[PDB]
Design a protein around this ligand. Structure first.
Ligand SMILES: O=P(O)(O)OC[C@H]1O[C@](O)(CO)[C@@H](O)[C@@H]1O
Ligand SMILES: O=P(O)(O)OC[C@H]1O[C@](O)(CO)[C@@H](O)[C@@H]1O
Ligand SMILES: O=P(O)(O)OC[C@H]1O[C@](O)(CO)[C@@H](O)[C@@H]1O
Ligand SMILES: O=P(O)(O)OC[C@H]1O[C@](O)(CO)[C@@H](O)[C@@H]1O
Ligand SMILES: [Cl-]
Ligand SMILES: [Cl-]
Ligand SMILES: [Mg+2]
Ligand SMILES: [Mg+2]
Ligand SMILES: [Mg+2]
Ligand SMILES: [Mg+2]
Ligand SMILES: [Mg+2]
Ligand SMILES: [Mg+2]
Ligand SMILES: [Mg+2]
Ligand SMILES: [Mg+2]
Lengths: 309, 309, 309, 309
């Protein structure tokens, strides 16, 4: 039984670390477990508020953090001097608000950076390119609870063993298919799509090479849809549209973490004009377009962008 | 704490029943709990086979059944003479095979009939119109575990309390909105749709009255998509198409139960030409088209069918 | 998987009952499960008050009761006319107060009678001899959670399956050994014992026939000590002493239920002068001496009583 | 929520450790959780064998150990060179065999030492006086699951939060009463006691100063009885007797750990002639007499030893 806590401590032993990142991850994972439990019994009772407190408190108490960015907080949270550590965490404590009442899969998203500037800790420490991620992942609260995690050496999948109360490694170093057979976007925005998105979607439904149309899936929780894309392959799209000209999804704590996971699994994640991880953030709640998945599907989307530009 | 077992026994006390239906439901619910538990720890290990055995064994042992129809069994299962009861159960022991690996919501579906013929128990006892349902419902194994149940007096929702190990009533007599704002179908089959489906879908994305386009959602597990339709309103479609000319979804143990639930909640469920519950089944594994949800959305779909016929 | 709910409903099907006792037992068992859960997480927070409310509410709501006697209530609780059923329940909702802080096994004890008088329901309906018990048992909240139950056809043991959230039959028709090798009493009261108890205890430690002395065990929760006596054999004693001249243990909701269980398993349960189940109660909180266990050990205790009288 | 994993990592951050002890404790605690779960569902199925494997595998995999002593293994287990760490663990993976069938509290016991010799790792590294313990504690699998732990700075109590799946600090720096009112030993061995034990026990039942006799408690699992002694005060005795002239309890992995806990809480733990922690072990499965608890009660026992020597 390779537990996440035993896996992470072991990974930190081979790298001769001080144990600070390990302490941070353990704290994050503890918050995730409390969130999983609250989610499993939610209807028997706001959850946004609770999951946000849980994450902030656990992270700050780890003595590993200097700056936190949460979806739930207008401004960056600076860690009190007495608990100052070297890491910056951007997180979405509970994503998939739209699906809570209807019991669909929802999740938690996070990315961890090392503070590199010499200055006093500020929001600017949270404005690194995703290419500078130290660790990132997500939890999926679905038919079972799962964490996808990467620290730069590929993507590992862990599942909450409910009897044992701990995360157990179920898949090591997962790789996305080069090409899938599923496309995933909200086609309710079709009226507002750019020409590139329209053309790409048309190619999926009416291919010109005799292949079967792709199947469509859209849970409407990003973590569920991205996780499906990871394990089954294909493409997930939340592009710019007329109602959301800069996209809807948030760069720091939605797009960068999933982009990091998808790239680590051998996939691609793009704004349409450049890799998501290469976008230099200008503000903590900045939005970007997100198109991600199997490299050949994303590469085909990029061709549509290129001939329509 | 109004538990499902206490709710069902109480419902049977006011109706002066022998307790046979109550015994049947309790058995079904016990199978559901075992399924929930196996689902929650699935990745840590086929599940179709297991959930099928669980349901068959629990139902047969209730002394309440004479005939069972399962998705997993070519032929109807006749209950051994010594355990013969008066009820017929059609069930899908685990639905949403496509979503198991990716951890999306999956479910169990069932409908219960009283055997009305005088003959020896046979498959023909399972070929009643859904309009003759005595009890029907589904379990949803999602971020939490839920059962929707009706015995003819509206739809009640129950949630598995994990600490207590029992189903607890969370919503009594639920009603679907008259009109929703979500449409749900696999648009990957667009190339194969009939004119009516094409036109309806076009109206959702490009309305002609100045209203916002509907949002699209499609989990790709029927129970998840139908449950969302129930609680948020809107429309779910699995119509006939060129690849599935009679539809894909199964009449006895997929469509009739959800149709029964949706109608009990004040919604509509149609094949496109008639109510699902009014279809006289000719074979236990018969397929039908399924269009269901908020009455005004379904009524609008039926208008598209009518002007394209 | 023979669950308690399926076992009890089945037992009621063969006996052509109205289902009223079955509804009562299910309710009692639901309270037991809630108690088990509260007990498992007690230190992470009175419990007497909670467990009492749980039992009273569940029993009254079953529409099966007319009179309740609780250890926690000075007077008998008469069921409101609208929920009147035919049964009387005497219960100790949580026994083993002394062991809660130190985490030793604790339990719940109950006996069920049919009201036989024609009069208005009163405390007098709870003053039947234990010989008139319809059903009785206990729950043990120990290293695992167990229920011992009898309805007149021997003793069955059930264990809470934590994954499944239900009681499962683990042993059918259990029989106590004719003679054991363990004696169980608080020897701290030795100064206050009568001559009979003194002599019996001396015989256990200094036998005159060359046999090994009995081992001593005393958890100090009656349910734990009685359950051990049931499965390992031997003798449990809470006799009269100078500080408690009529004994300490309560007749209605401590002694009668365990006496009923022990007798059903082929054991004996005595006051020292007569079987516990044959004592005609005069008051709802009456105390009796309790000596119970393997028939040959109890029979040997009775010989000490006889030669010292 | 101060979790054990967060508490232990934090305790290791202030002490600038390499994290090796922390990794060891986490591993031990993970084994404890698996044991708790197996114990909670034991009757629904040897456990000695399982719990032994769990502990050995978890400890060896921590890269923190060089030598293990288990009750279940004749010889010391030398850690393979590739996983060699600096610590020695003596453990009883599951104690209280006698109480498993009857569902009474049972436990796991452990003591951790730093290897101090320069030689190749051998059994001799496990023969340090308990006074050289680095960390020690026990788990109690009772009505709830608890760990008592000390690393030299007093005794902390943790409880398994079943919803959260982790140990949570419930009491910091616990102190035993100076004098209690409970004595705990198997009085079935009275025929075989030495004069000192006889006299001490007589004083508890027949005091000569007008005080009330002590109450007697004896669960017959050492961990349960010792834990009760810790939280309620009093005295626990397993002295030498004619059948067990050197005592029964094992020095390395039963007596030293509980002695360490009791001393850290301000109590005393003696063989009758010297502190348990000061005994120099000569063999890994050596037995000693054990008398422990509130200092004034133990001090009174020692006076009986002294006037009978
Ligand atoms: O309804 P829409 O516009 O498709 O938005 C759904 C998206 O919004 C989110 O809830 C976060 O903004 C994602 O989880 C999901 O992908
Ligand atoms: O991939 P498709 O064709 O959309 O099929 C999905 C449907 O199939 C099912 O798995 C059952 O056939 C449903 O749960 C779901 O609605
Ligand atoms: O401390 P004593 O006098 O031995 O009393 C213990 C007895 O009291 C009870 O807590 C109930 O009165 C029983 O569970 C137990 O047998
Ligand atoms: O039956 P006895 O001799 O009192 O032995 C009980 C003791 O044995 C053990 O099981 C371990 O030897 C302890 O847990 C307990 O204190
Ligand atoms: Cl989902
Ligand atoms: Cl106990
Ligand atoms: Mg969010
Ligand atoms: Mg979000
Ligand atoms: Mg199926
Ligand atoms: Mg199906
Ligand atoms: Mg009580
Ligand atoms: Mg009591
Ligand atoms: Mg042992
Ligand atoms: Mg032992």
């Amino acid at each position: 039984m390779l537990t996440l806590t035993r896996y992470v401590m072991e990974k930190g032993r081979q790298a001769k670390g001080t144990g600070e990142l390990t302490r941070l991850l353990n704290s994050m994972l503890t918050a995730i477990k409390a969130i999983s439990s609250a989610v499993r019994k939610a209807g028997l009772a706001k959850l946004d508020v609770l999951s946000n407190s849980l994450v902030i408190n656990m992270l700050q108490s780890s003595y590993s953090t200097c700056v936190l960015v949460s979806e739930e907080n207008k401004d960056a949270i600076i860690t009190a001097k007495e608990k100052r550590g070297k890491y910056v965490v951007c997180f979405d404590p509970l994503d998939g608000s739209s699906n809570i009442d209807c019991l669909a899969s929802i999740g938690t998203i996070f990315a961890i950076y090392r503070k590199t500037s010499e200055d006093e800790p500020s929001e600017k420490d949270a404005l690194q390119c995703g290419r500078n991620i130290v660790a990132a992942g997500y939890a999926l609260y679905g038919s079972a609870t799962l964490v996808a995690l990467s620290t730069g050496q590929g993507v590992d999948l862990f599942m909450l063993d409910p009897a044992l109360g701990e995360f157990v490694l179920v898949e090591k170093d997962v790789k996305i298919k080069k090409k899938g057979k599923i496309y995933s976007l909200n086609e309710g925005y079709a009226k507002y799509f750019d020409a590139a998105t329209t053309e790409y979607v048309q190619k999926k439904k009416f291919p010109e090479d005799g292949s079967a149309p792709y199947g469509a899936r859209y849970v409407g929780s990003m973590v569920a849809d991205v996780h499906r894309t990871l394990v089954y392959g294909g493409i997930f799209l939340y592009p710019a549209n007329q109602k959301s000209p800069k996209g809807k999804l948030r760069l720091l704590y939605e797009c960068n973490p999933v982009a990091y996971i998808i790239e680590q699994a051998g996939g691609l994640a793009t704004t349409g004009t450049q890799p998501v991880l290469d976008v230099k953030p200008e503000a903590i709640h900045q939005r970007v377009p997100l198109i991600l998945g199997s490299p050949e599907d994303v590469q085909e989307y990029l061709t549509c962008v290129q001939k329509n530009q």
